């Protein structure tokens, strides 16, 4: 389909509110909240039973998988999950399962049956490359490769899941992933997502994400570096990748600290506005819609405070996601970045489609600054009357020299308008 229509929620099911054994039941009820917030895709962290020998914390990391064919019953049964994605589909939503196939848990059921499928040490036992709940797969193995594609197929054919986020790090070859697509595309056209900045991966994946942008972004907040490192990087990113590529934007995920730790409420909103209006595909990581600065505990017993009071961060999230969900500007238009007077303070970019425009002007520093923007390739002389999507204000911008002087502060400008 048009994968630019996806707005994604990363959900940690085991950590959801509710009782043990009943976590899918809970997430099923939560779909209506997610749907009404503008989510169309929920991305499940691994839901498999966890390694026992080697286990960090009382429960173990979800990324240390003891059985690729089973679900952690401290989350739910297969019935619970199968009910959960049927609900999702009824609600016109998509479900993605996390596929960590580059390493298994030390006591994963495969380490017994097939030691040969793993990288082995000098004396023939399965091992890892990096110095420990986890052991690395040997993907020179033709039988391993067929096992994995069939396990991905089962989950598809049995629970009708919609896509996969794959861990691609380490010794997994691009040909393996292409092999998966050759066998699984005819089964169902799935949403294929990975974490990578390797341009070749788009041969196998539709959407990727990486931390290139993210740390340039982190550095600007933490005062460590310039906004321009962040923006000029995004500005040139089209040139790092083939034509139809999609990048997934995010302010945090499971692997990163809570974004609300680093910004004020008012600054964060500028970055929320950015999240939902910038080219790409937005990620809401469970809890960020409540501006949670509580870290995900990922190995021990943990429940995230989901609901969650409906604060100004929650309302904005819903407002922007629902807006994107209902317009076709971001799914079909073109975004271009706009050079401005104050590149150390402000972000600015324009969408066109082709009468509909959205000029976004962001000011995460919040301080009142007048910024001028360059509209050379278009336009030189007009007065624009727009509605600022962010707060339903009215904003007029006059361009009278191919340029336009704008006052900003505290509130992001998401200036939606139409010429003709």
Written overview of the protein:
By secondary structure, this protein is α/β, with parallel strands linked by helices. The protein folds into two domains: 332 residues, TIM Barrel (Alpha-Beta Barrel); 88 residues, Immunoglobulin-like, CATH 2.60.40. It has ten helices and 18 strands. The strands form four sheets. Strands 1-2-3-6-7-8-9-10 form an eight-stranded parallel beta barrel. Strands 11-12-13-18-15-16 form a six-stranded antiparallel sheet. Helix 4 packs across helix 5 and helix 6 runs antiparallel to helix 7. The chain starts with 7 loop residues before the first strand and ends with a strand. This is Alpha-amylase. It holds the Pfam family Alpha-amylase. The PDB classes it as hydrolase.
Question: Can you summarize this structure?
Answer:
InterPro entries: AmyB-like_C, GH, GH13_cat_dom, Glyco_hydro_b. The chain has helices spanning 23-36, 78-90, 109-113, 142-159, 174-184, 212-221, 227-236, 265-277, 312-326, 329-332; strands spanning 8-11, 41-44, 94-99, 103-105, 134-136, 163-166, 191-195, 207-209, 246-249, 281-285, 334-337, 347-352, 356-362, 369-374, 382-388, 393-399, 403-408, 413-418.
């Amino acid at each position: 389909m048009n994968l630019k229509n996806l707005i994604i929620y990363e959900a940690f099911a085991r950590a959801y509110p509710g009782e043990k054994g009943k976590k899918f039941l809970s997430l099923e009820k939560d779909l209506e909240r997610l749907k009404g917030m503008g989510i169309n895709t929920v991305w499940l962290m691994p839901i498999h039973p966890t390694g026992v020998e080697g286990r960090k914390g009382t429960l173990g990391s979800p990324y240390a998988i003891r059985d690729y064919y089973e679900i952690d019953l401290l989350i739910g049964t297969k019935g619970d999950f199968k009910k959960f994605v049927k609900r999702a589909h009824e609600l016109n939503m998509y479900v993605l399962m996390d596929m960590v196939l580059n390493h298994a848990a030390v006591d994963n059921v495969l380490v017994k049956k097939h030691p040969e499928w793993f990288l082995r040490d000098e004396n023939g036992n399965p091992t890892r490359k990096v110095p420990s709940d986890v052991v690395d797969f040997d993907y020179s193995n033709g039988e391993l490769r067929e096992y994995m594609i069939n396990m991905m197929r089962y989950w598809v054919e049995e629970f009708d899941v919609d896509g996969f986020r794959c861990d691609v790090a380490g010794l997994v070859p691009l040909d393996f992933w292409l092999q998966a697509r050759k066998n699984l595309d005819p089964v169902k056209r799935l949403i294929w997502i990975s974490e990578t900045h390797d341009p070749y991966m788009y041969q196998a994946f539709d959407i990727t994400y990486d931390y290139d942008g993210y740390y340039r972004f982190r550095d600007f907040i933490e005062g460590k570096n310039s906004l321009r490192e962040y923006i000029d990087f995004l500005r040139m990113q089209d040139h790092m990748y083939p034509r139809g590529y999609i990048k997934m934007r995010f302010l945090e995920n499971h692997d990163q600290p809570r974004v609300a730790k680093f910004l004020s409420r008012e600054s964060l909103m500028h970055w929320i506005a950015f999240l939902f209006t910038v080219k790409g595909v937005p990620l809401v990581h469970n809890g960020q819609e409540y501006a949670l600065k509580e870290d995900l505990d990922i190995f021990n017993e943990y429940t995230l405070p989901i609901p969650g009071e409906e604060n100004e961060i929650f309302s904005l999230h819903r407002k922007l996601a629902h807006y994107r969900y209902k317009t076709n500007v971001f799914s079909n238009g073109e975004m271009i970045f706009i050079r401005n007077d104050q590149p150390e303070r402000v972000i600015s970019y324009l969408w066109r489609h082709g009468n509909r425009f959205i000029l976004c002007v962001l000011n995460p520093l919040l301080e009142n600054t007048s910024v001028t923007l360059d509209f050379s390739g278009i336009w030189e002389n007009i007065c624009i009357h727009s509605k600022n999507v962010f707060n339903d204000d009215i904003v007029r911008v006059s361009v009278k020299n191919s340029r336009a002087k704008i006052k900003v502060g505290r509130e992001p400008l998401i200036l939606s308008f139409v010429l003709y």
